[PDB]
Each structure stands twice: as structure tokens, then as C-alpha cells.
């Protein structure tokens, strides 16, 4: 029905977890998994990552012991999304935010926390947490040398384990009924992998807790699973660290699965495009850390896996193929690029441009005709497009019409004022495959932008065409 | 309590909705709005937009009536959220998806709506409903040349009104627990703003009903109010058109408030600002509109505004201040372009580096020394940092990496020193301003001055010696 949230909320902090449970069957299926594998989309909160909770947790354990009053500054080293919390936490109860994060996290990341105020301090990616330089150690500096300075240190503060282990594992534990027979849980601070499981396991001991590390990190047990590859960068970010935080509880974790970058990613693009839904790369690193460990497991008893942050702080990063072209990833198996690859194959526009017949080309215009004269030239030349010479784009014969009636084209004005602007420049030698990707952007794709002597247009309908012609 | 989610859902679609409604106090006491301003944050469903429920609900009566079946194609034109919306429900339910949308529209749609494996086709901006080339008429040929290929067409489909007279309105009246005065709705297809001003003047017809409508649209009553931009291309995506679609019945609205792009956007970076809601533009554009209706009334009524969809499909386009800049609208009041440009002004860092006194050449490596020479020398030379040559430039190395590397058996002592440098760094030069080195050290830690007369950098520039200026001023 609508118990929680049936009613007004004060603020935003008001609207942070209660995160519905999802069955993850299309992807199991696909991944010939028995089991039932649920997902905690804890990215479906307000600030679209699992560290709203313990943001706001420290932002009311710090208010609840009088350690924080109004006009006073918060500093806290994150990956992105505490900061995201906090920020948030600061714009409505009106403190200031300073972040210190690593130069490996998204620009996204920055940018929302710019877009709330909160200045940032960025860190090299190399620096460990000893170096002067690490985003602790730069956190510490701002602290003593500002005013009113507090922070709250999500690596240590008690808070953030014992939330997960007071509202988010009740949560899971009320939805699941208590059935649980599988905990799968990102390990980055371990607040959340040690309040979850050990919450669980007090109600249900006889639930599996399974932590996932990326490959780089020096958190799982024993070390013997670590020198695979130690102490490396991972374009994963949130998860794993090359220290154990206070927080973190290793002894509540039974099994640890170690999971590298380009399965993480992979995973994640193989969890949009079967469930749908927007998860980060860590959720693809739990989710393959799940599909490597629940796979003893049968029908009816449950596997339940964290999703920790959306796709909004990686937009522009992992969603976009051409990152994960750079970074040589396996984009997915059942996705637009290998499906385009398959079907045109080493195709490219000259063929099609032949197997057409298209040995006709489009009459051309000085781009600054007026109307009237364009008209007439539409009329008798019997062609129905024509592009602006110099590019400034393409002009059809049903625009024409249709503007001059709609009041935006006099007869006497400039085409440049009805003509599409929208364009995208190719030439003979390119692939259907790339061609088919600018059509993505571009509704026309015009060629031979030599000499300007192109041939024509070629649009997403004439693909179609051409893999009719063919199969 | 827990009464919508305390069980498991068998899929994403049954995640939509259910969006609570949360009072933005601090907007309205920033703005001076009496009232209070609610918000029904429909950005926080699964898909992250209002448009997810009447996609599910398309669906739904589509298959209800027998007039769908696994394996078909469905086709829609959308400007991006019912086209997200429509994946996911063929995702999950195993249908095809190709989607028309105009080139105006985001490139986060376009990419997103490819992983969820739909195929998409642009239509030119500039062309107008009547036009072959538009995503209506696009997607009407693309229905008679495919086979089993379906349009549901959110413009006339009458799904998309009576959901939201059915469940969205209800939702709003029993979350506003029936009194609610104002109700300001964004005017795109008009469905949500029929559906639900009709279910609220059914239980309340105190209730005034406002439209917001883009300043280029010709939606709004009477046409004397959009004589200031008639038919004018404009950057907010979502609300708008260049006609009446089949669901939007006007009548049902009492006021409408035109807005252009400047406001909508200034707007919603206030939201974001001041409130803590990562919304989109429209959201914007309705709340200024809201601003702008509800300034006449008074404390205790409720003024609600929808908030159709969320950042994350405008996340590179009007987040990011670059590209705001490009279109020169005002940020905000108060935000950290503005604050950057008051609290440095036209200083320069030649001025820092002059007031502090530097006098110095910071020491070169070859960038290829063995760990045991570039010691010595630092050894020898007392300083902590050094610069790094190629092998453009390669970054900064400092004393204490160098030594906690060493220990963490990641720093051979014969291991070159591209191993332990810091590979983010930030090109500038003396004459670069304070604001734009501010703007660029929120993406690099370390800023070094004059790369590439000679290349004789005179040192490195963190954020803790903006600060230490700022702490030389008052
Ligand atoms: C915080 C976070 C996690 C989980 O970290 P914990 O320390 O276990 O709470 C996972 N992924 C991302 C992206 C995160 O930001
Ligand atoms: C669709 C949409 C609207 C309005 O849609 P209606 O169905 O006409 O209410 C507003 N904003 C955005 C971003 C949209 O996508």
C-alpha cells in the first residue's frame, strides 16, 4: 500500500532508503543460474547510493551529541557518494562541505557535489593512504588549518556500520521474510558488508556472507588471493582499498571473490540491458562476485546482492561505448555494437552506394538563396532534398512548405533560417558499423564533407533497406 | 512503514511510482514564498521519470486486449523518458524497441536507451509535426515497413491521462491528505496535467490548475502568450510542442505560465542547490512557473508542483557550468562560479606566486632515473617535490610516496620513476586566472605553471595555496 511515505516529508534526508527489493530472473536465466537472485537497489534512494544512509546517520549521531551547530564546516574523504550524502545532509541543515576524493572518481561525481556547494580537493590516484597527499591525509590538513573544521571519518565512524546493521539489514530481513541463504556485499569501508551480515547472521545464522574485492585491493582473506594483482589501480571506483578500515569487520565474512574491471563492467551493461536497471560498476562487481559464488546454490532459497550506486556518477563514463572501447572491455553479450558488428559486418557505404544504384547526385545551393528561387529550382530540377553548400545542412521540399505556412518562412528570407542544422560528416571509406553509431546523434549523415563533390544522404532507413537487400 | 515494498517485486516495472512528495522550505524561504511549496519528486522512480507509468500502463492495456505478443516490435516518438520508459517494459517483458526522438534532445537518452537494446533514429530539431522527417512521422513509416511493429503513441494514447487520474493524482491527494489549493504541472503531451487536474477538481475543486508551457510552444491560452517566441527553438527537453496533442484537453486548466530557458535552468540549479533534489530542466521551468502563479497566496495552502524527471539524462548538458557558460545563463545566486569570481576577482597567479615569493626553479628528473639517483639528489638537494620529464609532461613525484611505495613492495629501488609518479596533472600558464586554475583543480590535484620561450616551470599550485591567499585577504 503506502505506509512510508503516504505521507509529507520535511526534507530530502527524510527520503533516504527504503529501497524495494527486485528479482533478478531474466538475468539469471541468461547466466543459467537456479537460485533466486535479489537485488537491494539501494541506488533508488534520493541521493542515488547507498552512503545517503550513513551520511545522514553521522550528520544525526554528531547534531545528537551537540558536536555540531549551525555555520560549521564538514570534511570528508570519499570515493563520491559519502560526499554526495554529506553535501546533501549540509545543504538542508545548512553546514558547509569540503571534499577530498581521489582524481581516479568520475567528473560526474564532482560536478553534483559542486552543483551543492561543496568545495573539492582532488588526490592522485597512485598516492596511498600513508602519503602526504592521500585524501585522509589531505582531509586531516584541512581540518587543522580551518576554523570550525569537523570530520566525521566514514572509515571509522561507528555509525556507518551500525546503520546498515539497524535499517538496512532489517530492511532486507523484513522483505525476505528471514529467509536468507546468501549475503553478497561490496567490500570498500566494510560498513555496510559488516553491520549487514552481522545482522543477518544474528536472525539467520545459517545465511552464507560472500565479500566481493576488486582485483588490486589487499581487503580479502587470505592475502594468497590479493597477489594476483597488488597495489594496482582498478577503473572500478567505491569498492576496495589498500587498507582495513575500523569499520570493517573481517571476521564476519565467510567467502571473498575477488572480481577484475572488465567483468564488473560487463556485468553491470548485462544487468541494464536484461533488468533494467541503472546500476553502477560496482554493482556489476557484486553481481559477478554473486554469479561466481551462488552457483551451489538451487531453486527456492535466496541470494541477495547489493546494488550500491546508480549510473548517474558514470553517464559519461562506462554507459558511453567508446570508454569501453579504449579500455578494450567486453561491452556485453546481447548489445548494439556485436549485433551491428554481426549484421553489417566489413560492409561500408560504397557498397551500398552501388548495390543502390545511386548514380545520382543532389543538386547543390550557394546556402544564402532566397525562397522563391529555391522553390523553383525544387520544382525543376523533380529532386526532394537538397543540402547547403559553403557545411550548414540539408533542406526537403516538405519543410519548405510546411514553414512557409507555419509563419517561419517568408519568401524573401534566407534558407539558412529552414535549414536542418543537424549533420554528420562521412566519407566513402567508412564502415556501416561507425556510420550506424553517428546516426545515433546525427538524423542525416551527409558524405565527402578532395573536392565538396558528395553523391548524397544516407539516413538509418536506407540501413534497413540494405539489410533487406542482403540475408 | 513498510506497505509497498515489504515484499520482492518480480521485476522493474512494478518499482515505478510511489514517488514521495517532500516540502522544499528552504527554496521557498530563499525565493520568499509564503505557501508551502510541495514537490512530488517523480525523478526517484526506477526509470527515473514520470513517463514510466504510462509506458507500463501502455503495455498493460496493450496486453490486456490481446493486442501485443512476445516477440512483436514496439515503436514510439518520444523526447527521451517514455522512450526509456517503453525499454525497460520491452526489456523485461521481451519486446523489441526503436525509438524517434529529435536531435535537440540529450545524448545521455540516446545512450541509455542503447543499453537497454532499443534502436535509435534522430529526427532534425527544426522540423515541424507536419514534416516526413519528424519522429511521429518517422515512426508511423517505420510502422508500415516492419512487420509485427507497434506504436502506442503517448500523444493520443489515452493510457497516458487516466494514469495519472488514476494513480499519480490519487497518490498526490492522499500524500496532501485532500487539501491542496495550487497544482502546477509542466505542459508536454498534456496527460499528466489533464489526468490529474481532473482527478483533484473531482475531489477538490478549490484546487487552481496551472500549466507550464516553454516559451515556443503554442500550448499555452490564449495565443497572446506565445507571440514572444512563436515557434522559437528552445534547450529545455520534455515540455512543449507545435501543436495540441490528442490527450491534453485545455480546458482542464485554469492559469499558464510561460518560461523561458535561462529561468527553467537558473531554477533548477537552485533546486539542486538549495533543496538537495538532482531533478532535470522541466522540473525547473514548473517551479518557476510555480514561483511566479502562487505568489499571491498566503501561509498554510499548498502550492504542488510535479518534478517530471531526473538528472542523470541531463547530467553533461546543463550540470556541468562549461556548458552553461556556453549558453550564458546565470548560474545561481549562490554557487561556486559566482562565489570564485567575487572572492578572486582578475587575480592571477603571477600575484600568488609574487605576494608568497617563489624566486626558485623547482628541480628537473629525467623521468627515467633509477629510485636510488633521484634519492640522492632529492637527499642532496633538500627539496620534498620534483617534476618529471617525458617518456609531454608526466607529473610530480614526492618524497613521502617515493618512501611509502618503497616499503609497500610496489617501488623497486631499481624500478624507473614513471612507476611512482602521479600521472593527473593540469597544463597553465602565469597569465591564467584564479578562478579558471579553481575551476580546473576540482578534475587535477596538482596544477603546474608554464609548459612549453623555454619550458622553465617557476612551481606547482595546489587548492591549499588558494587558500592560504584567500587567508592573506578578508
Ligand atoms: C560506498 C560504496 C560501496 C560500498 O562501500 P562500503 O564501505 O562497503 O559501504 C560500493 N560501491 C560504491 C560505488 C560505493 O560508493
Ligand atoms: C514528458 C515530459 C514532461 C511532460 O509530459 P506530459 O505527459 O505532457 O505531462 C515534462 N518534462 C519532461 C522532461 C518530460 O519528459
Not at 57 to 79: F, Q
Not at 89 to 106: F, H, N, Q
Not at 109 to 132: F, H, Q, Y
Not at 281 to 289: K, L, M, P
Request: with cysteine; hydrophobic share 40%; charged share 25%.
Amino acid at each position: 500500500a503506502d505506509g512510508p511515505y503516504s505521507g509529507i516529508l520535511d526534507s530530502v534526508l527524510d527520503a533516504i532508503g527504503n529501497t524495494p527489493m527486485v528479482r533478478m530472473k531474466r538475468l539469471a536465466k541468461v547466466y543459467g543460474l537456479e537460485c533466486d537472485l535479489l537485488a537491494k537497489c539501494e541506488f533508488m534512494s534520493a541521493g542515488g547510493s547507498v552512503k545517503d544512509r550513513i551520511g545522514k546517520a553521522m550528520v544525526e549521531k554528531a547534531e545528537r551529541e551537540g558536536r555540531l551547530k549551525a555555520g560549521d564546516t564538514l570534511i570528508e574523504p570519499t570515493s563520491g557518494n559519502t560526499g554526495i550524502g554529506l553535501a546533501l545532509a549540509a545543504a538542508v541543515r545548512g553546514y558547509r562541505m569540503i571534499v577530498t576524493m581521489p582524481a581516479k572518481m568520475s567528473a560526474e561525481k564532482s560536478n553534483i557535489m559542486k552543483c551543492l556547494g561543496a568545495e573539492i580537493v582532488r588526490t592522485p590516484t597512485e598516492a596511498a593512504w600513508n602519503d602526504e597527499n592521500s585524501h585522509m591525509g589531505v582531509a586531516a590538513k584541512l581540518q587543522r588549518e580551518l576554523e570550525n573544521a569537523h570530520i566525521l571519518d566514514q572509515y571509522n565512524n561507528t555509525a556507518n556500520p551500525m546503520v546498515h546493521y539497524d535499517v538496512t539489514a532489517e530492511e532486507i530481513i523484513t522483505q525476505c521474510d528471514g529467509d536468507i541463504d546468501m549475503v553478497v556485499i561490496g567490500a570498500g569501508t566494510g560498513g555496510t558488508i559488516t553491520g549487514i551480515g552481522r545482522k543477518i547472521k544474528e536472525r539467520c545464522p545459517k545465511c552464507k556472507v560472500v565479500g566481493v574485492d576488486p582485483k588490486g585491493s589487499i581487503l580479502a582473506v587470505p592475502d594468497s588471493l590479493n597477489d594476483e594483482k597488488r597495489l594496482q589501480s582498478y577503473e572500478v571506483e567505491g569498492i576496495g582499498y589498500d587498507f582495513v578500515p575500523g569499520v570493517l569487520d573481517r571476521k564476519v565474512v565467510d567467502e571473498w571473490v575477488k572480481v577484475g574491471d572488465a567483468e564488473s563492467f560487463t556485468t553491470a551493461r548485462a544487468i541494464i540491458r536484461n533488468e533494467g536497471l541503472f546500476v553502477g560498476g560496482s554493482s556489476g562487481a557484486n553481481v559477478w562476485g554473486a554469479l561466481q559464488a551462488a552457483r551451489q546454490l538451487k531453486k527456492g532459497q535466496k541470494c541477495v546482492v547489493l546494488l550500491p550506486d546508480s549510473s548517474r556518477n558514470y553517464m559519461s563514463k562506462f554507459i558511453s561505448d567508446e570508454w569501453m572501447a579504449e579500455h578494450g572491455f567486453a561491452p556485453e553479450d546481447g548489445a548494439k555494437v556485436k549485433e551491428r558488428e554481426k549484421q553489417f559486418g566489413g560492409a561500408r557505404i560504397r557498397d551500398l552506394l552501388s548495390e543502390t544504384g545511386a548514380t545520382s547526385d543532389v543538386p547543390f545551393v550557394t546556402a544564402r538563396l532566397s525562397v522563391e528561387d529555391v522553390i523553383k529550382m525544387m520544382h525543376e530540377t523533380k529532386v526532394k532534398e537538397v543540402i547547403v553548400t559553403e557545411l550548414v545542412g540539408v533542406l526537403s521540399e516538405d519543410h519548405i512548405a510546411h514553414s512557409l505556412q507555419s509563419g517561419r518562412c517568408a519568401m524573401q528570407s534566407p534558407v539558412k533560417d529552414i535549414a536542418f542544422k543537424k549533420l554528420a560528416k562521412a566519407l566513402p571509406s567508412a564502415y556501416l558499423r561507425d556510420v550506424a553509431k553517428a546516426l545515433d546523434f546525427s538524423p542525416y549523415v551527409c558524405v565527402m564533407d578532395e573536392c565538396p563533390h558528395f553523391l548524397g544522404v544516407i539516413t538509418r532507413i536506407d540501413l534497413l533497406h540494405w539489410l533487406a537487400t542482403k540475408q
